[PDB]
Amino acid sequence: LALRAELLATQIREPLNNSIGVLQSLTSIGKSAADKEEQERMLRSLFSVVGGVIISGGLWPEPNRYDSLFFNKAVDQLSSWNGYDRESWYLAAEREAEGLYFWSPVYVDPYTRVEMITVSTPYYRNGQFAGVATVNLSLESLIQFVAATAEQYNLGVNLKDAFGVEVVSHNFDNALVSYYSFGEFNWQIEVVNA
Numbered sequence: 001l002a003l004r005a006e007l008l009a010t011q012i013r014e015p016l017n018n019s020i021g022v023l024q025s026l027t028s029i030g031k032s033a034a035d036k037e038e039q040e041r042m043l044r045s046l047f048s049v050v051g052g053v054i055i056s057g058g059l060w061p062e063p064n065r066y067d068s069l070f071f072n073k074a075v076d077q078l079s080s081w082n083g084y085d086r087e088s089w090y091l092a093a094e095r096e097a098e099g100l101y102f103w104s105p106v107y108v109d110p111y112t113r114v115e116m117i118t119v120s121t122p123y124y125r126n127g128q129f130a131g132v133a134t135v136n137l138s139l140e141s142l143i144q145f146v147a148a149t150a151e152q153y154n155l156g157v158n159l160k161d162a163f164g165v166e167v168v169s170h171n172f173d174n175a176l177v178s179y180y181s182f183g184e185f186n187w188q189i190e191v192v193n194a
Helices: 002-030 036-047 090-091 139-152
Strands: 056-061 069-072 116-123 128-138 155-160 164-168 177-182 187-193
Touching: 002 036, 002 056, 002 116, 002 128, 002 139, 002 155, 002 177, 002 187, 036 056, 036 069, 056 116, 090 116, 090 128, 116 139, 128 187, 139 155, 139 164
Parallel strands: none
Antiparallel strands: 056 069, 056 128, 116 128, 155 164, 155 187, 177 187
């Protein structure tokens, strides 16, 4: 249960760290001093990754009016938002040190209509704040992945955000439990044998 929970956290940190990887690619594109055209070309490619936990995401430059490059995977570039400058995820990252990542709570996107978590980071150009990159992670994609991984280790699992919020619950009585906090983000798993 101990080592088995450690190997589960390892296998669950893969899509999360790869969410950071994509987000770092978004930041580089925002810092690239690129015209909107080429940017659309590259952002469609980056999201063209097959499957995964990411459902949508894009770039959100400082207003002044609005020029957000948002994309969703159903890939179709979205139109609305153009404001996003007053959105929780936007503000948490506005004019923050480049390289910091902010995980939002679980919420329902009004536009795309998906239960998700929004990780946000700022990108800079010429030592000036330029915008915010975001990556939206589908809760259903994260749930099926964690459920299939734990069940393959013959375990029940309860993963929680740093918010201590029940993100997923799978097969979780006199029983032993293992609490494993992992990652720069303060997520934890509660694991039993199933």
